[PDB]
Structure formats: C-alpha cells, structure tokens
Design a protein around this ligand. Structure first.
Ligand code: MG
Ligand code: MG
Ligand code: MG
Length: 152
RNA sequence: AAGGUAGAGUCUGCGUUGAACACCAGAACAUAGGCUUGGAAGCAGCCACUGUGCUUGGAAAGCGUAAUAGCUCACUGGUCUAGCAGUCUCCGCUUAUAUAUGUCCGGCACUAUUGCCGAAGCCCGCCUAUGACAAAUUUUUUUUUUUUU
C-alpha cells in the first residue's frame, strides 16, 4: 500500500461536494447500493437540478463484510460478451469475490444509476475499500449511517 | 400428470399396560403339503391353505444354488424412551432434452374501500373561433289658412 495510498489521492472529479463515509459491516449489497445510488445522484439535496451533475464523494469501507442472502453466492452470475464468436463469459458470485471482492457493490451501484453519459463521473465518486481504512484520513468527511435495519 | 418441495386451515389407523423406522432378533413339527420333471425340498407351470405348542412364524416379498442350504424379509417379548403418521385444501417457487450469434423478472436488486405519485381526463388563470342569454326613468323641437282681373 506504498503507492495505493498515493494514487487514490489523485482526484479527477469536481470537488465542491461533500465526502461521505459508510461502514458496510452487515449491510446487504442491494439496499446499500440503493442508498449509495441516491447519495451519488445528488437527490438528497434541495438544490437538485437534473442537468447539473452534483453529488457526493461516497467512500465505502469494509467491502468484505457484505453478504448475499439466499444462496446468491453460488447461483448469482455476472455475464458479459467479448464481441467474438462464442464470447459469452459468466462468472459466479463466489468467483467474483475471489477475483475482485469490491466488484459486487460496484456492479450493484452501476446497475442503479441513470444510463447516460454522466455515469462515468458518478462512478468515479464511488470509492470502495475492502478493509477498514481509507486514504482519506485527514479529509473532512461526514458519515452516512443507514436507517436502522430492523423493519423486520 | 409427478417427487420426503416447503407455510397454513379439521376429524382420526399409531402410541408413556414401553411406541413406525433405529437395537438383541424367537423365527418352527409330521414334511420334501398334491401332479409333472433327473431334482420341485417356503416359491418353473399349477392345485391346496390339514392341525400343532403359539407372546410370536405368511405355505412364505426374496440374492441364491440340481435343491436342500449358504442367508434372511414379514409376524413378536424387552432396548431406545416422546417419539407421532396419511387420509382432505391452497399457495411462493419446481420437474418433464436444442431461447442451436449473446443473458428471456425490462435491467439492477430483494429470503390501505386512499395517505401520496400519476394523463392532453377534471378544476383554475389568460387567449381564440362560433353560437345563445343578459345587460346597454321628458315626451314636444316652431315653418302659415291667403292673393292679382
Ligand atoms: Mg377535479
Ligand atoms: Mg379541462
Ligand atoms: Mg366571443
């Protein structure tokens, strides 16, 4: 992590926004992805404009405390094509965790954003970290705790 | 149509006088019950279903042998000891072989007789065209019958 703490501090995006930190301990990937999508679009702001791309810098820690309920570790797949004949590639969720474990929440947030050309800028602002610390230690960052889970 | 697919709605064959499965297993005599066949010995084809001491043992579901047997299932005392079925009814997902370029819930995801959103409907403001209906208390305002031989 000698240079990984350096590269994540290199910012391409606009920075008039607010930084958010979310602990993903015990959170279901779908509901956390819904809340992260709402924060990323900037619709938690009274000054929201559909044309203007505001939002928040969402930082997620503990990406491997994230669970997939009802045997979706072996049955949920991730499929794409290569453009070549026979190019269907389907990866299971356990193999997706064993390849890159932050991609579960990454793809879940990607499927919930609006499908336009502002999606690249919104997916920049989602920074998902597997372990419990992030490079933005000294930053002024405001925590987003979700509403309590016990509706059931 | 089909499987120990599950969640719920009633009477009941079981069953705390030792219980389905799980455990020690008693598991038989005149006999090899009567025809055939070389042998038909609990059972190739078939006919019979005599008794017996019985808490139990079917002429007997069977691997099986020239067949007895090598083994046992079913029927019953106790062990385990609170176990406990299969008859009726739906439901959220299933099974029945080519989506044969590349995913078939739209994707991502998830194990309310009314509050709100929601249309060019309806109401409100303004405008246009064509139709109707409504509205918009002092009359009189002067001017001629005639005349000249
Ligand atoms: Mg109305
Ligand atoms: Mg109207
Ligand atoms: Mg008019």
């Amino acid at each position: 992590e000698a240079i990984k703490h350096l590269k994540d501090l290199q910012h391409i995006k606009l920075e008039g926004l607010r930084f958010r930190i979310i602990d993903a301990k015990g959170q279901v990937v779908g509901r956390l992805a819904e809340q992260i999508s709402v924060i990323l679009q900037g619709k938690d702001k009274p000054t929201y404009n559909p044309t203007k791309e505001q939002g928040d810098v969402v930082i997620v820690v503990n990406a491997s405390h994230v669970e997939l309920t009802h045997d979706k570790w072996n049955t949920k797949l991730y499929r794409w094509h290569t453009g070549y004949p026979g190019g269907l590639r389907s990866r299971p969720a356990g193999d997706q965790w064993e390849k890159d474990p932050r991609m579960l929440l990454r793809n879940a947030v990607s499927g919930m954003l609006p499908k336009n050309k502002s999606r690249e800028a919104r997916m920049e602002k989602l920074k998902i970290f597997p372990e419990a610390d992030h490079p933005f230690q000294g930053f002024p960052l405001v925590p987003y705790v979700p509403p309590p889970r016990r509706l059931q």
